[PDB]
Coordinates of C-alpha atoms and ligand atoms in Angstrom, one line a residue:
Chain A
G138 CA -27.1 19.5 -23.7
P139 CA -29.8 21.3 -21.4
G140 CA -31.4 19.1 -19.0
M141 CA -30.3 17.5 -15.4
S142 CA -26.5 11.6 -14.3
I143 CA -23.9 8.6 -12.7
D144 CA -25.8 5.6 -13.9
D145 CA -24.7 7.1 -18.0
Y146 CA -21.7 5.9 -16.1
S147 CA -20.5 2.4 -16.8
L148 CA -17.8 1.7 -14.0
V149 CA -19.6 3.0 -10.8
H150 CA -20.1 -0.3 -10.0
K151 CA -17.3 -2.2 -10.5
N152 CA -14.4 -3.3 -8.1
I153 CA -10.8 -4.4 -8.7
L154 CA -11.1 -6.7 -5.4
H155 CA -12.3 -11.1 -6.0
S156 CA -15.5 -10.3 -4.1
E157 CA -17.6 -7.2 -2.9
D158 CA -17.9 -9.7 0.6
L159 CA -13.6 -9.3 0.6
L160 CA -14.0 -5.8 0.8
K161 CA -16.5 -5.8 3.3
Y162 CA -14.3 -7.3 5.4
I163 CA -11.1 -5.2 5.0
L164 CA -13.7 -2.1 5.9
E165 CA -15.3 -3.6 8.6
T166 CA -12.3 -5.6 10.6
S167 CA -9.5 -3.3 9.9
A168 CA -10.8 0.2 8.3
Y169 CA -14.2 1.3 10.6
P170 CA -12.9 0.3 13.5
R171 CA -10.3 2.7 12.7
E172 CA -11.7 5.7 11.1
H173 CA -12.0 9.2 13.0
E174 CA -15.5 9.6 13.9
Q175 CA -15.4 13.1 11.3
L176 CA -14.1 11.0 8.6
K177 CA -17.3 8.1 8.9
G178 CA -19.7 11.4 9.7
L179 CA -18.1 12.5 6.3
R180 CA -18.4 9.6 4.7
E181 CA -22.0 8.7 5.5
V182 CA -22.6 11.7 3.9
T183 CA -21.0 11.7 0.7
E184 CA -22.6 7.9 0.1
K185 CA -25.7 10.2 -0.3
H186 CA -24.4 12.3 -2.6
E187 CA -25.2 12.0 -6.7
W188 CA -21.1 11.2 -6.8
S189 CA -20.8 9.2 -4.3
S190 CA -18.7 6.5 -6.5
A191 CA -15.9 9.1 -6.5
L192 CA -15.2 8.5 -3.1
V193 CA -11.8 7.5 -1.3
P194 CA -12.9 4.1 0.7
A195 CA -11.9 4.1 3.9
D196 CA -8.9 1.4 3.6
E197 CA -7.3 3.2 1.0
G198 CA -7.7 6.3 3.3
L199 CA -5.8 4.8 6.1
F200 CA -3.2 3.8 3.7
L201 CA -3.0 7.2 2.9
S202 CA -3.2 8.6 6.7
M203 CA 0.2 5.2 7.3
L204 CA 2.3 6.7 4.6
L205 CA 2.2 10.4 5.9
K206 CA 3.1 9.1 9.6
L207 CA 5.7 6.9 8.4
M208 CA 6.9 9.6 6.1
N209 CA 6.8 12.4 8.5
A210 CA 5.5 14.1 6.2
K211 CA 4.8 18.2 6.9
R212 CA 3.5 20.3 3.8
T213 CA 1.5 18.2 1.6
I214 CA -1.1 19.1 -1.4
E215 CA -4.1 17.4 -2.5
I216 CA -5.8 17.7 -6.0
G217 CA -9.2 17.0 -6.1
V218 CA -10.8 17.2 -2.8
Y219 CA -14.6 16.6 -3.7
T220 CA -16.6 16.8 0.1
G221 CA -12.7 16.4 1.3
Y222 CA -12.3 12.6 3.0
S223 CA -8.9 12.3 1.8
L224 CA -8.1 15.9 2.7
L225 CA -9.2 15.5 6.1
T226 CA -7.0 12.2 6.4
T227 CA -4.4 13.7 5.7
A228 CA -5.4 17.1 8.0
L229 CA -5.8 14.2 10.9
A230 CA -2.8 12.1 10.2
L231 CA -0.3 15.6 9.9
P232 CA 1.3 16.8 13.0
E233 CA -0.6 20.3 14.9
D234 CA 1.8 22.4 12.7
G235 CA 1.1 20.4 8.8
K236 CA 0.5 22.6 6.0
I237 CA -2.2 21.3 3.7
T238 CA -2.7 23.1 0.2
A239 CA -6.0 22.1 -0.9
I240 CA -7.0 22.4 -4.7
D241 CA -10.7 21.8 -6.4
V242 CA -13.1 23.4 -9.3
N243 CA -15.7 22.8 -7.0
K244 CA -15.8 24.5 -3.7
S245 CA -19.8 23.1 -3.5
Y246 CA -18.4 19.8 -2.9
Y247 CA -15.8 20.5 0.1
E248 CA -18.9 22.6 2.1
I249 CA -20.8 19.4 2.2
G250 CA -17.1 17.7 4.4
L251 CA -16.0 20.9 5.7
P252 CA -18.6 21.0 9.4
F253 CA -16.6 18.0 9.9
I254 CA -13.3 18.9 9.1
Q255 CA -13.8 22.0 11.0
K256 CA -15.3 18.8 14.5
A257 CA -12.1 17.2 13.7
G258 CA -10.4 20.5 15.0
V259 CA -7.6 20.8 11.4
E260 CA -9.2 23.2 9.5
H261 CA -6.4 25.4 10.3
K262 CA -3.7 23.4 8.4
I263 CA -5.8 23.7 4.4
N264 CA -5.4 26.0 2.9
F265 CA -8.5 25.5 0.3
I266 CA -7.7 27.2 -3.5
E267 CA -11.1 27.3 -5.6
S268 CA -9.7 26.5 -9.8
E269 CA -8.5 24.5 -12.0
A270 CA -6.0 22.1 -10.8
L271 CA -3.2 22.7 -12.9
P272 CA -3.8 27.0 -13.3
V273 CA -2.8 26.6 -9.4
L274 CA 0.5 24.3 -10.2
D275 CA 2.1 26.8 -12.8
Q276 CA 2.1 29.4 -10.7
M277 CA 3.4 27.8 -7.6
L278 CA 6.5 26.8 -9.6
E279 CA 6.6 30.4 -10.6
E280 CA 6.4 31.5 -6.6
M281 CA 8.5 28.5 -4.9
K282 CA 11.7 28.2 -3.4
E283 CA 13.4 24.6 -2.6
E284 CA 12.9 25.9 0.7
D285 CA 8.9 25.5 0.0
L286 CA 8.6 22.3 -1.5
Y287 CA 6.0 19.5 -1.0
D288 CA 6.2 16.5 1.2
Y289 CA 3.5 14.3 -0.2
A290 CA 0.5 15.2 -3.2
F291 CA -2.5 13.1 -3.7
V292 CA -3.8 13.7 -7.8
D293 CA -7.2 12.8 -7.6
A294 CA -8.6 15.8 -9.8
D295 CA -9.5 15.5 -14.1
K296 CA -8.8 11.7 -14.5
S297 CA -7.9 12.8 -18.5
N298 CA -5.0 15.3 -17.1
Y299 CA -2.6 13.6 -14.5
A300 CA 0.2 13.3 -16.9
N301 CA 0.2 17.2 -17.2
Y302 CA -0.2 17.3 -13.0
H303 CA 2.9 15.4 -13.3
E304 CA 5.2 17.1 -15.1
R305 CA 4.3 19.9 -12.2
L306 CA 4.1 17.6 -9.6
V307 CA 8.1 16.1 -10.4
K308 CA 9.2 20.1 -9.3
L309 CA 7.0 20.6 -6.7
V310 CA 7.4 17.5 -4.4
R311 CA 11.2 17.8 -2.7
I312 CA 13.8 15.0 -3.6
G313 CA 12.5 12.1 -1.4
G314 CA 8.8 13.0 -1.6
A315 CA 5.5 11.7 -3.2
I316 CA 3.4 11.7 -5.3
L317 CA 0.7 9.5 -5.4
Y318 CA -2.1 9.4 -8.5
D319 CA -5.9 7.6 -7.2
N320 CA -7.5 5.5 -9.5
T321 CA -4.8 4.1 -11.8
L322 CA -6.2 0.6 -12.1
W323 CA -10.0 2.2 -13.2
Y324 CA -11.9 -0.5 -12.0
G325 CA -10.0 -2.6 -14.1
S326 CA -10.5 -1.3 -17.1
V327 CA -6.5 -0.5 -17.7
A328 CA -6.1 -4.3 -18.1
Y329 CA -7.1 -4.5 -22.0
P330 CA -6.5 -2.3 -25.2
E331 CA -10.1 -1.9 -25.7
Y332 CA -13.1 -2.1 -23.2
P333 CA -16.9 -2.1 -24.4
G334 CA -19.6 0.3 -23.5
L335 CA -18.1 3.2 -21.4
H336 CA -19.2 6.6 -21.0
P337 CA -16.9 9.2 -23.1
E338 CA -15.7 10.4 -20.1
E339 CA -15.0 7.1 -19.0
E340 CA -13.0 6.5 -21.7
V341 CA -10.6 9.2 -21.8
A342 CA -9.5 8.6 -18.4
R343 CA -9.2 5.0 -19.4
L344 CA -6.5 5.4 -22.2
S345 CA -4.8 8.5 -19.9
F346 CA -4.1 5.2 -17.5
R347 CA -3.2 3.8 -19.3
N348 CA -0.9 5.8 -21.2
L349 CA 0.7 7.3 -17.6
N350 CA 1.3 3.8 -16.4
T351 CA 3.1 3.2 -19.0
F352 CA 5.1 6.5 -18.8
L353 CA 5.3 6.3 -15.4
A354 CA 7.1 3.0 -15.2
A355 CA 9.5 4.5 -17.9
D356 CA 10.0 7.7 -16.4
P357 CA 13.7 8.6 -14.4
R358 CA 12.3 11.1 -12.3
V359 CA 10.5 8.7 -9.5
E360 CA 10.6 5.5 -8.5
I361 CA 7.4 3.8 -8.7
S362 CA 5.2 1.3 -6.7
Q363 CA 1.5 0.7 -8.5
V364 CA -0.7 -0.6 -5.3
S365 CA -3.9 -2.5 -5.8
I366 CA -5.7 -0.2 -2.9
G367 CA -9.0 1.6 -4.0
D368 CA -8.9 1.8 -6.9
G369 CA -5.1 1.3 -7.8
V370 CA -3.0 4.0 -5.9
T371 CA 0.5 4.6 -7.9
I372 CA 2.8 6.1 -5.4
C373 CA 6.0 7.7 -6.9
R374 CA 9.2 8.7 -5.1
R375 CA 11.2 12.0 -6.7
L376 CA 15.0 10.9 -6.9
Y377 CA 16.9 13.6 -8.6
Chain B
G1412 CA 3.7 -35.9 12.9
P1413 CA 1.9 -38.7 11.3
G1414 CA -1.2 -37.5 9.3
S1415 CA 3.7 -31.1 1.5
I1416 CA 2.9 -28.1 -1.1
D1417 CA 0.6 -29.6 -3.4
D1418 CA -2.1 -30.4 -0.8
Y1419 CA -2.6 -26.9 -0.3
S1420 CA -6.3 -25.3 -1.6
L1421 CA -5.0 -22.1 -2.3
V1422 CA -2.4 -21.5 -3.6
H1423 CA -4.1 -20.5 -7.6
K1424 CA -6.7 -17.7 -6.0
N1425 CA -6.4 -14.3 -6.6
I1426 CA -7.5 -11.2 -4.5
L1427 CA -8.2 -9.5 -7.4
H1428 CA -11.2 -9.7 -9.8
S1429 CA -9.3 -11.5 -12.9
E1430 CA -5.9 -12.8 -13.2
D1431 CA -5.8 -10.6 -16.5
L1432 CA -5.7 -7.8 -13.9
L1433 CA -3.0 -9.1 -12.1
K1434 CA -1.0 -9.6 -15.3
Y1435 CA -1.4 -6.0 -16.2
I1436 CA -0.1 -4.8 -12.9
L1437 CA 3.0 -6.9 -13.0
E1438 CA 4.4 -6.3 -17.1
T1439 CA 3.7 -2.6 -16.6
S1440 CA 4.3 -1.7 -13.0
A1441 CA 6.4 -4.4 -11.8
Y1442 CA 8.6 -6.2 -13.7
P1443 CA 10.1 -3.2 -15.9
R1444 CA 11.0 -1.5 -12.3
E1445 CA 12.3 -5.1 -10.9
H1446 CA 16.3 -5.5 -10.7
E1447 CA 17.8 -7.8 -12.9
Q1448 CA 18.9 -9.7 -9.2
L1449 CA 15.4 -10.0 -8.0
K1450 CA 14.3 -11.2 -12.0
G1451 CA 16.8 -14.2 -11.5
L1452 CA 15.3 -14.9 -7.9
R1453 CA 11.8 -15.1 -8.8
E1454 CA 12.2 -17.4 -11.9
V1455 CA 14.1 -20.0 -9.9
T1456 CA 12.3 -19.5 -7.4
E1457 CA 8.9 -20.1 -9.2
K1458 CA 10.4 -23.6 -10.3
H1459 CA 10.8 -24.7 -6.2
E1460 CA 8.2 -27.0 -4.7
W1461 CA 7.0 -24.1 -2.2
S1462 CA 6.8 -20.8 -5.2
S1463 CA 3.3 -20.6 -4.3
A1464 CA 4.5 -18.7 -1.0
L1465 CA 6.5 -16.7 -2.7
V1466 CA 6.3 -12.8 -2.4
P1467 CA 4.9 -12.0 -5.9
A1468 CA 7.1 -8.1 -7.5
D1469 CA 4.0 -5.7 -7.1
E1470 CA 4.3 -6.4 -3.6
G1471 CA 8.0 -6.4 -3.8
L1472 CA 7.8 -2.7 -4.4
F1473 CA 5.4 -2.1 -2.3
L1474 CA 7.7 -3.0 0.4
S1475 CA 10.9 -0.7 -1.5
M1476 CA 8.9 2.1 -1.8
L1477 CA 7.5 2.1 2.6
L1478 CA 11.5 1.5 3.4
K1479 CA 12.5 4.6 1.6
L1480 CA 9.8 6.7 2.2
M1481 CA 10.2 6.1 6.0
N1482 CA 14.7 6.2 5.6
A1483 CA 14.7 2.8 7.1
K1484 CA 17.9 1.8 8.5
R1485 CA 18.1 -1.4 10.3
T1486 CA 15.4 -4.0 9.3
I1487 CA 14.2 -7.6 10.6
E1488 CA 12.9 -10.5 8.1
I1489 CA 10.9 -13.2 9.5
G1490 CA 10.7 -15.9 6.5
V1491 CA 13.0 -15.5 4.2
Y1492 CA 12.6 -18.7 1.7
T1493 CA 14.8 -17.6 -1.3
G1494 CA 14.9 -14.3 -0.3
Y1495 CA 13.0 -11.6 -2.9
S1496 CA 11.7 -9.8 0.4
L1497 CA 15.4 -9.8 1.8
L1498 CA 16.8 -8.5 -1.7
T1499 CA 14.2 -6.0 -1.9
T1500 CA 15.1 -4.6 1.2
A1501 CA 18.8 -5.0 1.0
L1502 CA 18.3 -3.2 -2.1
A1503 CA 16.2 -0.4 -0.5
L1504 CA 17.9 0.9 2.1
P1505 CA 21.5 2.8 2.3
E1506 CA 25.1 1.2 1.7
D1507 CA 25.5 0.8 5.5
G1508 CA 22.4 -0.5 6.1
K1509 CA 21.5 -3.7 8.0
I1510 CA 19.3 -6.3 8.3
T1511 CA 18.4 -9.3 10.5
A1512 CA 17.4 -12.3 8.5
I1513 CA 15.4 -14.9 10.0
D1514 CA 14.8 -18.4 8.9
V1515 CA 14.5 -21.8 10.3
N1516 CA 15.8 -23.5 6.1
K1517 CA 18.8 -21.9 5.1
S1518 CA 18.9 -24.0 2.4
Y1519 CA 16.4 -22.7 0.7
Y1520 CA 18.1 -19.0 1.5
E1521 CA 21.1 -20.7 -0.5
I1522 CA 18.8 -21.3 -3.2
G1523 CA 18.2 -17.0 -3.7
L1524 CA 22.0 -16.3 -2.1
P1525 CA 23.6 -16.2 -5.6
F1526 CA 21.5 -13.4 -6.8
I1527 CA 22.0 -11.3 -3.2
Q1528 CA 25.5 -11.3 -3.8
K1529 CA 25.8 -10.8 -7.6
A1530 CA 23.2 -7.8 -6.5
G1531 CA 25.9 -6.4 -3.7
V1532 CA 24.0 -6.8 -0.6
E1533 CA 25.0 -9.4 1.4
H1534 CA 26.6 -7.6 3.5
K1535 CA 24.0 -5.6 4.7
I1536 CA 22.4 -9.1 5.9
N1537 CA 22.8 -11.1 9.4
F1538 CA 21.5 -14.9 8.1
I1539 CA 20.3 -16.2 11.3
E1540 CA 19.2 -20.4 10.8
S1541 CA 16.7 -20.7 13.8
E1542 CA 12.9 -20.6 14.6
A1543 CA 12.3 -17.3 15.0
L1544 CA 10.8 -16.7 18.4
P1545 CA 13.8 -17.8 20.1
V1546 CA 15.9 -15.7 18.4
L1547 CA 13.2 -12.9 19.0
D1548 CA 13.1 -13.9 22.6
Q1549 CA 17.1 -12.9 23.2
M1550 CA 17.1 -9.9 21.2
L1551 CA 14.6 -8.7 23.5
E1552 CA 16.6 -9.6 26.7
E1553 CA 19.9 -8.0 25.1
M1554 CA 18.1 -5.2 22.2
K1555 CA 19.3 -1.2 23.7
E1556 CA 16.4 1.6 23.2
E1557 CA 19.1 2.8 20.5
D1558 CA 19.2 -0.1 18.2
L1559 CA 16.0 -0.4 18.3
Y1560 CA 14.9 -1.7 13.9
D1561 CA 12.9 0.8 11.7
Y1562 CA 11.1 -2.6 9.6
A1563 CA 9.8 -5.5 10.1
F1564 CA 8.5 -7.4 7.8
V1565 CA 6.7 -10.9 9.2
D1566 CA 5.9 -14.1 7.0
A1567 CA 7.5 -16.9 9.0
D1568 CA 4.7 -19.5 10.4
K1569 CA 1.0 -18.2 9.8
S1570 CA -0.4 -19.9 12.3
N1571 CA 2.3 -18.2 14.9
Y1572 CA 2.0 -14.2 13.9
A1573 CA 0.4 -12.9 16.8
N1574 CA 3.0 -14.6 19.3
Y1575 CA 5.3 -12.9 17.0
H1576 CA 3.7 -9.8 16.9
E1577 CA 4.0 -9.9 21.2
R1578 CA 7.7 -9.9 20.6
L1579 CA 8.0 -7.4 17.5
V1580 CA 6.6 -4.2 19.1
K1581 CA 9.3 -4.4 21.8
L1582 CA 11.9 -4.6 18.8
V1583 CA 10.8 -2.0 16.2
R1584 CA 11.1 1.9 17.4
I1585 CA 8.9 3.8 18.3
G1586 CA 7.2 5.2 14.8
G1587 CA 8.7 2.1 13.3
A1588 CA 6.6 -0.6 11.0
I1589 CA 5.7 -4.3 11.7
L1590 CA 4.6 -5.5 8.3
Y1591 CA 2.5 -8.7 8.3
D1592 CA 1.9 -10.5 5.1
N1593 CA -1.0 -12.9 4.1
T1594 CA -3.0 -11.0 5.7
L1595 CA -6.0 -11.7 3.4
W1596 CA -5.4 -15.8 3.3
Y1597 CA -6.5 -15.7 -0.1
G1598 CA -9.8 -13.8 0.9
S1599 CA -10.4 -17.0 2.5
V1600 CA -10.5 -14.4 5.6
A1601 CA -13.8 -13.5 4.5
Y1602 CA -16.4 -16.1 5.9
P1603 CA -16.7 -17.5 9.3
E1604 CA -16.3 -21.1 7.5
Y1605 CA -14.5 -21.7 4.4
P1606 CA -14.6 -25.0 2.9
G1607 CA -12.1 -27.2 0.9
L1608 CA -9.3 -26.6 2.6
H1609 CA -6.0 -28.1 4.0
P1610 CA -6.1 -28.7 7.7
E1611 CA -3.1 -26.2 8.0
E1612 CA -4.7 -24.1 5.6
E1613 CA -7.2 -23.9 7.6
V1614 CA -5.2 -23.0 10.7
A1615 CA -3.5 -20.6 9.0
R1616 CA -7.0 -19.0 7.8
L1617 CA -8.7 -19.2 11.8
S1618 CA -4.9 -17.6 12.2
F1619 CA -5.5 -14.5 10.4
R1620 CA -9.1 -14.4 11.1
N1621 CA -7.8 -13.6 15.3
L1622 CA -4.9 -11.5 14.2
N1623 CA -6.9 -8.8 12.4
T1624 CA -9.1 -8.6 14.6
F1625 CA -6.5 -8.4 17.2
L1626 CA -4.2 -6.0 15.8
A1627 CA -7.6 -3.7 15.1
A1628 CA -7.8 -3.5 18.2
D1629 CA -4.8 -3.1 19.5
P1630 CA -3.9 0.5 21.1
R1631 CA -0.3 0.2 20.3
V1632 CA -0.3 0.6 16.7
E1633 CA -1.8 1.9 14.6
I1634 CA -2.8 -0.2 11.5
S1635 CA -3.4 -0.2 7.2
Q1636 CA -4.8 -2.8 5.8
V1637 CA -3.6 -2.9 1.5
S1638 CA -5.5 -5.7 -0.5
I1639 CA -1.9 -6.4 -2.6
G1640 CA -0.2 -9.6 -2.7
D1641 CA -2.1 -11.9 -0.3
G1642 CA -3.1 -8.5 2.1
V1643 CA -0.2 -6.8 3.8
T1644 CA -1.0 -5.5 7.2
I1645 CA 1.7 -2.5 8.0
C1646 CA 1.7 -1.5 11.7
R1647 CA 3.2 1.6 13.0
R1648 CA 4.4 1.7 16.7
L1649 CA 2.8 4.1 19.2
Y1650 CA 4.4 3.3 22.3
Ligands
SAH2832 N1 -9.5 20.8 -13.5 C1 -9.3 20.2 -12.3 N2 -9.2 21.2 -11.6 C2 -9.3 20.9 -10.2 N3 -10.6 20.0 -9.2 C3 -10.7 19.4 -10.5 C4 -10.5 19.4 -11.6 N4 -11.6 18.4 -12.6 C5 -12.2 17.8 -11.8 N5 -11.7 18.2 -10.2 C6 -12.1 17.3 -8.8 O1 -12.1 16.7 -8.9 C7 -12.5 16.1 -8.0 C8 -12.5 14.7 -8.1 S1 -13.4 13.1 -6.6 C9 -11.8 13.8 -5.3 C10 -12.2 12.6 -4.2 C11 -11.4 12.5 -3.4 N6 -10.4 12.9 -3.9 C12 -11.9 12.0 -2.1 O2 -11.2 11.7 -0.6 O3 -13.1 11.5 -2.0 C13 -14.0 16.1 -7.6 O4 -14.0 16.9 -6.6 C14 -13.8 17.6 -9.0 O5 -14.7 18.5 -8.3
SAH2833 N1 8.7 -20.9 12.9 C1 9.8 -20.3 11.9 N2 10.9 -19.7 12.3 C2 11.3 -19.0 11.2 N3 11.4 -19.4 9.7 C3 9.7 -20.0 9.7 C4 9.3 -20.9 10.7 N4 7.9 -21.3 10.1 C5 8.2 -21.2 8.8 N5 9.1 -20.3 9.1 C6 9.9 -20.3 7.1 O1 8.9 -18.8 6.9 C7 9.8 -18.8 4.9 C8 7.5 -18.7 5.0 S1 7.7 -18.4 3.8 C9 8.7 -16.8 3.6 C10 8.8 -16.0 1.8 C11 9.7 -14.5 1.8 N6 9.5 -13.8 2.9 C12 9.6 -13.8 0.2 O2 10.4 -12.8 -0.4 O3 9.3 -14.7 -0.5 C13 10.2 -20.2 4.7 O4 11.2 -20.1 4.3 C14 9.5 -20.9 6.8 O5 11.2 -21.6 6.3
MG2834 MG1 -10.4 8.8 -6.7
MG2835 MG1 4.3 -14.8 2.1

């Protein structure tokens, strides 16, 4: 209730890889040398923030950048911005005329990263909307034409609500476009029907992801690839 | 020379934190999406002496997804074994897609060939039985700019990836992808020394540490090292 925290949360310090040494090797060898100076800055100030556990990591970021470039994405939607690491990643990867619709309930987080976005010279690509994501997506469904469908969506907002996001995004991303769901392995806790001692919010997210992973594997509208990078990323490609 | 598969130390090591997590991914997200003929090919390969070299099913779906997202049409596969990643590629490509597939050992390919045929995609594949570098070098002297590959999957002799790279950054189009398989070498690349390895395993481990450093510094490409399977490094040609 009234009072003032993130180790009432149980999964903060876990990782899906076998050792922290392997993760550090990947980051130091392959990610940090390829990370834009302004992503480095954004990440380092986020690492001191209360919710740094939620930050998209740098090896995952370079993978998002790679996918965006390989598929020649130009119009994207970013749901769950936090301090803007995945958003700046996207903005740097897109061509100069790329356009991003960015949605987050808490703009104060975004203002932490916004100076780095500005210095990188890519703020002009970003339309930031401070809102719960689902009302925005529902309004887009009434607004958008087939000419305006998105090439790519990155989904990283309310971890209990991805299935509802998916029902909108399979209509807002073009045929052949990509929807990426972040955190679909939820620190490994999805591997069991029951799991001990999580925060109620973490447990709701865990069950949501177990149900989402099963549903997406069964969903004829997409083909999928669940990738054990970061905390699990499920790539979906719209078939019809 | 004077001095086998069951001599390797690392074969059963996971890069994920538990076998249960890996099995979850495979049972939930990979096997339900694996083509019947890929399942059949995997099952016979699991029984083979060199099953440890098999590309796993979750990695397969990731390769397939990359191929479709980038609209690849012409590809090269280096290191075929029984054909799992080759069949993945051939199913992913359009009906008129084409693959150049190179392996020193066609007998391995013939294990998977019946499944490739039943999948109806053998016509996309030009299988060359040879060491890869002589083929790649002959391609360099014949390749026309308009025939450059969209995508290359590199999974052959581990100690030789750096030599393959020097050819492939010229054989794949600008904006095209070169994927190197096994770049985390079961996690053993994470340390300067790693006891208990077969001599060939240690050669590969050192080759990958050098390669990973080299690729991260190579201005001809952008890269992303992905902790899927045994590590896959995606390269994108810049010039
Ligand atoms: N219903 C909702 N709609 C939109 N954003 C939400 C939301 N519920 C939570 N969020 C936001 O989702 C974010 C999750 S963390 C996002 C991390 C970010 N992608 C990165 O690159 O690091 C938080 O910023 C939180 O404010
Ligand atoms: N110098 C060389 N040139 C071409 N192929 C080679 C080679 N050295 C080893 N190989 C081949 O590389 C393969 C490595 S295993 C490849 C696994 C396969 N990509 C899969 O999807 O499962 C073996 O079939 C081996 O015969
Ligand atoms: Mg996330
Ligand atoms: Mg391999």
